């Protein structure tokens, strides 16, 4: 009996790492939809791109408390909407060039929440 051999000899013809905004990926449960009253979060794949700087902006008819934490995988973003409507999430990296998939157009449903408030402060003027 006998057999043959098979290997692979190739040289690195690439720089390896290079400012690539496209490589940047985003996924989670917040992008799935807009849940008024629930806190959603999504991970930002920045391992292939690099430790480079990043930016995250959210628009809409009703502002939202945006949060950002330092993670070993990239950057975590948590936002909880209070009012329904059309929201937009921009993701920039390296420069003004946006990443693949963006902008993100998520639709938020479920009438606003109910809570005792709407109190006007004194000396409004």
PDB file of C-alpha atoms in Angstrom:
ATOM      1  CA  UNK A   1       0.000   0.000   0.000  1.00  0.00           C
ATOM      2  CA  UNK A   2       0.948   3.646  -0.471  1.00  0.00           C
ATOM      3  CA  UNK A   3      -0.373   7.205  -0.695  1.00  0.00           C
ATOM      4  CA  UNK A   4       0.516  10.679  -1.928  1.00  0.00           C
ATOM      5  CA  UNK A   5       1.177  14.011  -0.233  1.00  0.00           C
ATOM      6  CA  UNK A   6      -0.473  17.428  -0.496  1.00  0.00           C
ATOM      7  CA  UNK A   7       0.491  20.762   1.031  1.00  0.00           C
ATOM      8  CA  UNK A   8       0.169  24.513   0.545  1.00  0.00           C
ATOM      9  CA  UNK A   9       2.993  27.031   0.141  1.00  0.00           C
ATOM     10  CA  UNK A  10       1.825  30.622  -0.325  1.00  0.00           C
ATOM     11  CA  UNK A  11       3.360  33.944   0.705  1.00  0.00           C
ATOM     12  CA  UNK A  12       1.439  36.786   2.351  1.00  0.00           C
ATOM     13  CA  UNK A  13       0.733  39.043  -0.613  1.00  0.00           C
ATOM     14  CA  UNK A  14      -1.506  41.273   1.490  1.00  0.00           C
ATOM     15  CA  UNK A  15      -0.875  44.044   4.053  1.00  0.00           C
ATOM     16  CA  UNK A  16      -3.020  42.158   6.546  1.00  0.00           C
ATOM     17  CA  UNK A  17      -4.785  45.072   8.219  1.00  0.00           C
ATOM     18  CA  UNK A  18      -6.120  48.219   6.550  1.00  0.00           C
ATOM     19  CA  UNK A  19      -8.715  50.826   7.469  1.00  0.00           C
ATOM     20  CA  UNK A  20     -11.808  49.059   6.152  1.00  0.00           C
ATOM     21  CA  UNK A  21     -15.212  50.481   7.175  1.00  0.00           C
ATOM     22  CA  UNK A  22     -17.023  47.799   5.179  1.00  0.00           C
ATOM     23  CA  UNK A  23     -15.614  45.010   7.347  1.00  0.00           C
ATOM     24  CA  UNK A  24     -17.505  46.619  10.230  1.00  0.00           C
ATOM     25  CA  UNK A  25     -20.614  44.583  11.035  1.00  0.00           C
ATOM     26  CA  UNK A  26     -23.606  45.173  13.309  1.00  0.00           C
ATOM     27  CA  UNK A  27     -26.178  42.744  14.702  1.00  0.00           C
ATOM     28  CA  UNK A  28     -28.418  42.181  17.709  1.00  0.00           C
ATOM     29  CA  UNK A  29     -32.014  42.516  18.878  1.00  0.00           C
ATOM     30  CA  UNK A  30     -32.338  46.289  18.684  1.00  0.00           C
ATOM     31  CA  UNK A  31     -32.063  46.285  14.896  1.00  0.00           C
ATOM     32  CA  UNK A  32     -34.835  43.689  14.686  1.00  0.00           C
ATOM     33  CA  UNK A  33     -37.425  46.324  15.536  1.00  0.00           C
ATOM     34  CA  UNK A  34     -38.491  49.178  17.781  1.00  0.00           C
ATOM     35  CA  UNK A  35     -39.837  48.095  21.161  1.00  0.00           C
ATOM     36  CA  UNK A  36     -41.206  51.053  23.120  1.00  0.00           C
ATOM     37  CA  UNK A  37     -40.604  50.268  26.779  1.00  0.00           C
ATOM     38  CA  UNK A  38     -37.891  47.641  26.399  1.00  0.00           C
ATOM     39  CA  UNK A  39     -34.122  48.149  26.429  1.00  0.00           C
ATOM     40  CA  UNK A  40     -32.499  46.676  23.320  1.00  0.00           C
ATOM     41  CA  UNK A  41     -28.790  46.199  22.628  1.00  0.00           C
ATOM     42  CA  UNK A  42     -26.583  45.237  19.682  1.00  0.00           C
ATOM     43  CA  UNK A  43     -22.932  44.216  19.380  1.00  0.00           C
ATOM     44  CA  UNK A  44     -20.533  45.960  16.999  1.00  0.00           C
ATOM     45  CA  UNK A  45     -18.134  43.662  15.147  1.00  0.00           C
ATOM     46  CA  UNK A  46     -14.880  45.632  15.110  1.00  0.00           C
ATOM     47  CA  UNK A  47     -12.369  42.788  15.367  1.00  0.00           C
ATOM     48  CA  UNK A  48     -11.620  42.534  11.648  1.00  0.00           C
ATOM     49  CA  UNK A  49     -11.646  46.305  11.153  1.00  0.00           C
ATOM     50  CA  UNK A  50      -9.465  47.301  14.090  1.00  0.00           C
ATOM     51  CA  UNK A  51      -9.368  49.245  17.377  1.00  0.00           C
ATOM     52  CA  UNK A  52      -9.822  52.388  15.305  1.00  0.00           C
ATOM     53  CA  UNK A  53     -12.261  55.051  16.472  1.00  0.00           C
ATOM     54  CA  UNK A  54     -16.010  54.680  15.943  1.00  0.00           C
ATOM     55  CA  UNK A  55     -19.193  56.757  16.084  1.00  0.00           C
ATOM     56  CA  UNK A  56     -22.886  56.076  16.688  1.00  0.00           C
ATOM     57  CA  UNK A  57     -25.832  58.432  16.216  1.00  0.00           C
ATOM     58  CA  UNK A  58     -29.574  57.861  16.585  1.00  0.00           C
ATOM     59  CA  UNK A  59     -32.341  60.035  15.142  1.00  0.00           C
ATOM     60  CA  UNK A  60     -36.124  60.086  15.405  1.00  0.00           C
ATOM     61  CA  UNK A  61     -39.206  62.030  16.548  1.00  0.00           C
ATOM     62  CA  UNK A  62     -38.310  61.246  20.161  1.00  0.00           C
ATOM     63  CA  UNK A  63     -34.777  61.334  21.567  1.00  0.00           C
ATOM     64  CA  UNK A  64     -33.421  58.290  23.403  1.00  0.00           C
ATOM     65  CA  UNK A  65     -30.923  57.740  26.217  1.00  0.00           C
ATOM     66  CA  UNK A  66     -27.965  56.353  24.268  1.00  0.00           C
ATOM     67  CA  UNK A  67     -25.340  54.400  26.209  1.00  0.00           C
ATOM     68  CA  UNK A  68     -21.818  53.287  25.299  1.00  0.00           C
ATOM     69  CA  UNK A  69     -19.489  50.901  27.131  1.00  0.00           C
ATOM     70  CA  UNK A  70     -15.951  49.674  26.465  1.00  0.00           C
ATOM     71  CA  UNK A  71     -16.051  46.026  25.391  1.00  0.00           C
ATOM     72  CA  UNK A  72     -13.247  43.624  24.384  1.00  0.00           C
ATOM     73  CA  UNK A  73     -15.204  42.779  21.234  1.00  0.00           C
ATOM     74  CA  UNK A  74     -15.870  46.379  20.251  1.00  0.00           C
ATOM     75  CA  UNK A  75     -18.564  48.690  21.598  1.00  0.00           C
ATOM     76  CA  UNK A  76     -21.980  47.981  23.111  1.00  0.00           C
ATOM     77  CA  UNK A  77     -24.902  50.289  22.331  1.00  0.00           C
ATOM     78  CA  UNK A  78     -28.098  50.333  24.392  1.00  0.00           C
ATOM     79  CA  UNK A  79     -31.107  52.486  23.514  1.00  0.00           C
ATOM     80  CA  UNK A  80     -34.687  52.356  24.790  1.00  0.00           C
ATOM     81  CA  UNK A  81     -37.332  54.277  22.800  1.00  0.00           C
ATOM     82  CA  UNK A  82     -40.263  55.931  24.570  1.00  0.00           C
ATOM     83  CA  UNK A  83     -42.349  57.051  21.593  1.00  0.00           C
ATOM     84  CA  UNK A  84     -43.226  55.268  18.323  1.00  0.00           C
ATOM     85  CA  UNK A  85     -42.182  56.452  14.875  1.00  0.00           C
ATOM     86  CA  UNK A  86     -39.323  56.190  12.391  1.00  0.00           C
ATOM     87  CA  UNK A  87     -35.819  55.944  13.846  1.00  0.00           C
ATOM     88  CA  UNK A  88     -32.426  56.066  12.128  1.00  0.00           C
ATOM     89  CA  UNK A  89     -29.122  54.646  13.363  1.00  0.00           C
ATOM     90  CA  UNK A  90     -25.908  55.835  11.711  1.00  0.00           C
ATOM     91  CA  UNK A  91     -22.577  54.045  12.121  1.00  0.00           C
ATOM     92  CA  UNK A  92     -19.350  55.755  11.062  1.00  0.00           C
ATOM     93  CA  UNK A  93     -15.815  54.379  11.339  1.00  0.00           C
ATOM     94  CA  UNK A  94     -12.476  55.840  10.291  1.00  0.00           C
ATOM     95  CA  UNK A  95     -14.149  58.697   8.458  1.00  0.00           C
ATOM     96  CA  UNK A  96     -17.371  60.112   6.972  1.00  0.00           C
ATOM     97  CA  UNK A  97     -17.821  56.839   5.088  1.00  0.00           C
ATOM     98  CA  UNK A  98     -20.640  54.752   6.562  1.00  0.00           C
ATOM     99  CA  UNK A  99     -20.398  51.002   7.146  1.00  0.00           C
ATOM    100  CA  UNK A 100     -22.159  48.299   5.132  1.00  0.00           C
ATOM    101  CA  UNK A 101     -25.834  47.799   5.916  1.00  0.00           C
ATOM    102  CA  UNK A 102     -26.296  51.363   7.142  1.00  0.00           C
ATOM    103  CA  UNK A 103     -28.071  53.516   7.459  1.00  0.00           C
ATOM    104  CA  UNK A 104     -30.412  51.389   9.573  1.00  0.00           C
ATOM    105  CA  UNK A 105     -34.137  52.108   9.301  1.00  0.00           C
ATOM    106  CA  UNK A 106     -36.001  50.510  12.205  1.00  0.00           C
ATOM    107  CA  UNK A 107     -39.748  50.850  12.766  1.00  0.00           C
ATOM    108  CA  UNK A 108     -40.993  51.366  16.323  1.00  0.00           C
ATOM    109  CA  UNK A 109     -44.533  50.371  17.296  1.00  0.00           C
ATOM    110  CA  UNK A 110     -46.667  50.271  20.427  1.00  0.00           C
ATOM    111  CA  UNK A 111     -48.259  53.524  21.566  1.00  0.00           C
ATOM    112  CA  UNK A 112     -46.145  55.527  24.012  1.00  0.00           C
ATOM    113  CA  UNK A 113     -45.898  54.257  27.589  1.00  0.00           C
ATOM    114  CA  UNK A 114     -48.184  55.322  30.435  1.00  0.00           C
ATOM    115  CA  UNK A 115     -46.825  57.076  33.524  1.00  0.00           C
ATOM    116  CA  UNK A 116     -47.801  59.897  35.919  1.00  0.00           C
ATOM    117  CA  UNK A 117     -45.955  63.047  34.898  1.00  0.00           C
ATOM    118  CA  UNK A 118     -46.185  65.920  32.426  1.00  0.00           C
ATOM    119  CA  UNK A 119     -45.619  68.413  35.241  1.00  0.00           C
ATOM    120  CA  UNK A 120     -44.650  71.971  34.308  1.00  0.00           C
ATOM    121  CA  UNK A 121     -41.978  73.656  36.426  1.00  0.00           C
ATOM    122  CA  UNK A 122     -42.516  77.081  37.991  1.00  0.00           C
ATOM    123  CA  UNK A 123     -41.340  80.270  36.284  1.00  0.00           C
ATOM    124  CA  UNK A 124     -41.607  78.472  32.943  1.00  0.00           C
ATOM    125  CA  UNK A 125     -41.065  81.728  31.056  1.00  0.00           C
TER     126      UNK A 125
END
